[PDB]
């Protein structure tokens, strides 16, 4: 799907982000021993 | 999509196409039993580890192997098995899955 201004985004990134619902990269947490997605 | 050996179609297997062979983490074949009338299988992932059950007679299941991946799978999909032997003019023979 592509990223939907009316069309806008996190803007800035989410390290930095203000609206954590509609930005679609969510923060989590390393659980038992994995690699980081992203 | 797939087909099946006995009575072709008149298509050809084609799922994946590489020019030269990618990076494995596994390749090991299994023998079953040709006689039996269904199969079981246990498919499950626990911290990162993948792990397989398989049973051929009976009901109840063994252990199959393990394989580690590091990752966390998400989606799965059964595709379409295309051949002229699964039709409703021949004999009676469907797909259970
Ligand atoms: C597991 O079994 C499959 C199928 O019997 C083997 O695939 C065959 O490999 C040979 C040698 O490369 C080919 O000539 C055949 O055409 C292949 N058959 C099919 C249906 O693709 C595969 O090599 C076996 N794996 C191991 C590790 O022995
Ligand atoms: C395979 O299955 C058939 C029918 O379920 C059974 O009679 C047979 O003992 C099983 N094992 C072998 C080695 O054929």
């Known amino acids: ?38 | 999509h797939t087909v099946c050996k006995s009575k072709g179609s008149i298509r050809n297997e084609s799922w994946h196409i590489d020019s030269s062979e990618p990076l494995c983490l596994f390749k090991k074949n299994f023998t079953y039993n040709v006689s039996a009338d269904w199969l079981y299988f246990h498919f499950y992932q626990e911290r990162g580890v993948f792990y397989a059950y398989y049973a051929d007679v009976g009901m109840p299941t063994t252990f199959l192997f393990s394989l580690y991946l590091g990752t966390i799978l998400s989606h799965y999909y059964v595709m379409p098995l295309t051949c002229n032997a699964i039709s409703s003019n021949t004999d009676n023979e469907t797909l259970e899955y």
Do not use: A, F, M
């Not at chain 1, 009316?6 to 619902?21: K, Q």
């Open chain 1, 1 to 38: 799907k592509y990223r939907h201004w009316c069309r806008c985004s996190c803007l800035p990134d989410p390290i930095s982000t203000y609206s954590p619902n509609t930005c679609p990269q969510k923060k989590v947490v390393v659980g038992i021993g994995e690699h980081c997605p992203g």
